[PDB]
Symmetry: C2
Subunit: 296 residues, 2 copies
């Protein structure tokens, strides 16, 4: 069975669930605390696996307690790990998350430093025939452009049923990541990126950014509680409302849940309109529960 590969980041999330945001200079009891594997591409693998797809994760690790936890958790979710890249310096980041139950707020404190990223040389070793879909979390764009060019060259020699589908996520507002707009059949652009580029709504972002994507691609822009929108080569602006839970309890990884669910739905042959709705449905369900496993 062909797999879906996600290339990007893994971290350890240290999660603190509170009913009031902590007052500075105090020591207070949480409602609950837990460790949770995180990172955009890593979370997307979790969701793909829960939805039933065979998937693989490619990202950097360094030996230690965090790696042991992360690898055990990936195995618990049947995620294929043959392409992880073991580094000899640095640490896997431990991000601190505060989730406020009373309001649904999500506050993240992240590492000043990240491990060396998966390079184009690392990616050269991936057997592309094992994958029906490859999703790249935008990080080190110059190296990732080389990976995407390698996939394109592979696909140029494959017949239609053997081409590898490609998606990219442009989530951080860094200009170097905008090189990625012109790769992939599906480009996920975050609300933060859209606003950094001057666009104040999903529809405005689609109309303003569509000219950057590869000919024939679809641009997707989720806009949190306002749902998600897409624009592809047929020229039709698509929109799904969000599917909010009765109470927002945990939004950590909600965007990754949306992305993975859109990928899953498209991989099963559904239209972009159906995939957008499905992504909003699964992400909204996730926002009403802790972690990911309860999306079932």
């Amino acid at each position: 069975e062909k797999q879906i590969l996600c290339v990007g980041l893994v971290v350890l999330d240290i999660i603190n669930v509170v009913d009031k945001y902590p007052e500075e200079d105090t020591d207070r009891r949480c409602l609950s605390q837990r460790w949770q594997r995180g990172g955009n591409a890593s979370n997307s693998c979790t969701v793909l696996s829960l939805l039933g797809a065979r998937c693989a994760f490619m990202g950097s690790l360094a030996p230690g307690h965090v790696a042991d936890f992360v690898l055990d958790d990936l195995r618990q979710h049947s995620v294929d790990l043959r392409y992880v890249v073991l580094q000899t310096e640095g640490s896997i980041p431990t991000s601190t998350v505060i989730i406020n139950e009373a309001s649904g707020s999500r506050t993240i404190l992240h590492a000043y430093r990240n491990l060396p990223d998966v390079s184009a040389k690392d990616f050269e070793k991936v057997d592309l025939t094992r994958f029906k879909w490859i999703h790249i979390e935008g990080r080190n764009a110059s190296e990732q452009v080389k990976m995407l060019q390698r996939i394109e060259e592979h696909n140029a020699k494959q017949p239609l049923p053997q081409k590898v589908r490609v998606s990219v996520e442009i989530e951080k507002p860094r200009e170097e990541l905008f090189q990625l707009f012109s790769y992939g059949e599906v480009v996920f652009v975050s609300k933060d990126v859209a606003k950094h580029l001057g666009f104040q709504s999903a529809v405005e972002a689609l109309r303003g950014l569509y000219s950057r994507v590869k000919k024939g691609a679809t641009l997707v822009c989720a806009w949190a509680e306002e749902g998600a929108d897409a624009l592809g080569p047929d020229g039709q602006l698509l929109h799904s409302d969000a599917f909010p839970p009765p109470r927002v309890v945990d939004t950590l990884g909600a965007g990754d849940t949306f992305n993975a669910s859109v990928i899953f739905s498209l991989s099963k042959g559904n239209s972009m309109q159906e995939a957008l709705r499905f992504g909003c449905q699964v992400a909204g369900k996730k926002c009403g529960l802790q972690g990911f496993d309860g999306i079932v």
Copy 2:
């Protein structure tokens, strides 16, 4: 060589160093992040070892990644672990700490749940002849009173040079811990406890609480930037000013550093006046550096 035993808690501290307190609902970069072994008795062992005393830690653990980290860190500090209690249920807590560099503030989010505590039955197995000093972090007072009675019964059969010295810490404002005032030759009472009992300064706390201690004992009350005070059987109110660093950068474990340093100084034969000064000196130095190792 006789050891100093500390009975109490170990946790994993997940530390986030920031120059601005995090704004709720945002995702922001720290100046630095690290894992650090914590818990009052555990931190006191770290400081005793750094000062050169042979010491031992007795506390509960449960198997897993946190235990592996904690035990490795205790070994790195030459802390004797033969009396740790391995539990079959629960988790070692992971506490989240936010340290604000701009102000010196310390914010702690701690676990709703803690492991089963070291019991009197567990303590019955400790060979008291191995120890010249036993320090108990007040937690489960009814069990700990039984431990303290066992030490007293042991000491009643020992000559003067073979008696085990005893100290207790009463740090949390829980009425059941106040049973511990009447045990030990040295009782450390926190500012928080003093204020819960209605006393608004160290001197007022000493005069108001001294009647609770065992005949002949010394009550010690540190009051943060106002230094620390003590009152013993000679009737003399003692005080040391604090020794603040040029910039307060990290106060996590400062109270444990004070307690351990007082214990160390007394164990070396110094007076309470000298030990109070020494404790303020080491704790103030610690407040100007990250972690403990730099106290040298």
